[PDB]
Design an enzyme around this catalytic site. Structure first.
Site: not given
Ligand SMILES: Nc1nc2c(ncn2[C@@H]2O[C@H](COP(=O)(O)OP(=O)(O)O)[C@@H](O)[C@H]2O)c(=O)[nH]1
Ligand SMILES: [Mg+2]
Length: 388
Positions: A14, A77
């Site tokens: 996330d 993971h």
């Molecule tokens: N506020 C905010 N939310 C973000 C940002 N980048 C990602 N998110 C949110 O964090 C959540 C997880 O993002 P994701 O790309 O799927 O994370 P991953 O699990 O590392 O792949 C999603 O709801 C995204 O929209 C950001 O720069 N700002």
């Protein structure tokens, strides 16, 4: 063909890995030319199976002004663990995504440690979700924590590029410092901070021996694939592993119906060796430029233990387990020592272990291996450190 560089996004769940991956691909396409990828196309990672081990990975491609990048993103993971331990994706650099709100988290640390264990050469940081933090002192504090965490695992945290941005703002088409400019800054960091990987043809000569022959009227020939470097007729090689190291001269190189002056990385060929008998060369040994690789029986490794669904064990193994370690071409029995206090390892887990083989193998950190019992693969490892 300009430089081709393998990269990937690592970091805690996330924190924004898939969003950033989509933003990089889309913005590079719009800026330099290519194909744009959206969030849903990358979040859905296809399945690719190799040796029973299943890894879900998303692969995107994007171009910088001078390079072509191949980028891997993973959903779970376990996917990141399997991908890094095996040679599935050989990252030339990793993009550590860290949320500025929560800061480093347990998977942030595990992915840095894993990168150290498996030999990831460089790490760039994208400090993400900066749209949610207005206090620049707090951004500075979390950046310092990420740099120190990097240095804890021997990465050069003081020299690491740390790009502050919002992957979501950038993907949404926002301008300003945390929007598209931050993803272009990250791409500029990939270009400037990650060198092109050394070509196999430029490394020291190494050829694992796959077969040996005594040919009447010719002499002793070993066959294999040249993995690195060049060997010329008349040059000396060492025969390293299993037995005490010996040195001889190459007196011929050939492919099917083609006599050669030299053997080059990537080529599958036969090598004639002076003053050598078939019982002195054997499968599992390597030919190598003298003094460039050493035999070892003791090493530390990072190991992924296959789950039962992948055809591994369905019972834990204990400290002192003595399976076979398959190095390049052949099994060598070895005894396993686990970290202090650890008495058993569950299938599906990854662990750091020490190994003592019953015969030495030519090895440097980064050599991959399989763990087998009864010829069934039960683990995949990478040599983290050679013990001497
Ligand atoms: N506020 C905010 N939310 C973000 C940002 N980048 C990602 N998110 C949110 O964090 C959540 C997880 O993002 P994701 O790309 O799927 O994370 P991953 O699990 O590392 O792949 C999603 O709801 C995204 O929209 C950001 O720069 N700002
Ligand atoms: Mg994701």
């Amino acid at each position: 063909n300009k430089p081709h560089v393998n990269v990937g996004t690592i970091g805690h769940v996330d924190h924004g890995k898939t969003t950033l991956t989509a933003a990089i691909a889309t913005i590079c396409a719009k800026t330099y030319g290519g194909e744009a990828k959206d969030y849903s196309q990358i979040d859905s990672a296809p399945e690719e199976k190799a040796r029973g081990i299943t890894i879900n990975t998303s692969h995107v491609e994007y171009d910088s002004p001078t390079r072509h990048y191949a980028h891997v993103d993973c959903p779970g993971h376990a996917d990141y663990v399997k991908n890094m331990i095996t040679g599935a994706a050989q990252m030339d650099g990793a993009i550590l995504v860290c949320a500025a709100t929560d800061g480093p988290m347990p998977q942030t640390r595990e992915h840095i440690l894993l990168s150290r264990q498996v030999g990831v050469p460089y790490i760039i940081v994208f400090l993400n979700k900066c749209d949610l933090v207005d206090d620049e002192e707090l951004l500075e504090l979390v950046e310092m924590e990420v740099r120190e965490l990097l240095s804890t695992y021997d990465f050069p945290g003081d020299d690491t590029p740390v790009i502050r941005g919002s992957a979501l703002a950038a993907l949404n088409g926002e301008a300003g410092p945390y929007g598209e400019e931050s993803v272009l800054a990250l791409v500029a960091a990939l270009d400037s901070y990650i060198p092109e990987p050394e070509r196999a043809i430029d490394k020291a000569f190494l050829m694992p021996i796959e077969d040996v022959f005594s040919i009447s009227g010719r002499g002793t020939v070993v066959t294999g694939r040249v993995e690195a470097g060049i060997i010329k007729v008349g040059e000396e090689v060492e025969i390293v592993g299993i037995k005490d190291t010996v040195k001889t001269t190459v007196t011929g190189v050939e492919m099917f119906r083609k006599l050669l002056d030299e053997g080059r990385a990537g080529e599958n060929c036969g090598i004639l060796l002076r003053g050598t008998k078939r019982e002195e060369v054997q499968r599992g040994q390597v030919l190598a430029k003298p003094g460039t690789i050493k035999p070892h029986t003791k090493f530390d490794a990072e190991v992924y233990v296959l789950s039962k669904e992948e055809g591994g064990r369905h019972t834990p193994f204990l400290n002192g387990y003595r399976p076979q370690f398959y190095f390049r071409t052949t099994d060598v029995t070895g005894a396993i020592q686990l970290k202090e206090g650890v008495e058993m390892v569950m299938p599906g887990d990854n662990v750091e272990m020490s190994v003592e083989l019953i015969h030495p193998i030519a090895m440097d950190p980064g050599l991959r291996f399989a763990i087998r019992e009864g010829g069934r693969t039960v683990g995949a490892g990478v040599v983290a450190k050679v013990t001497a």
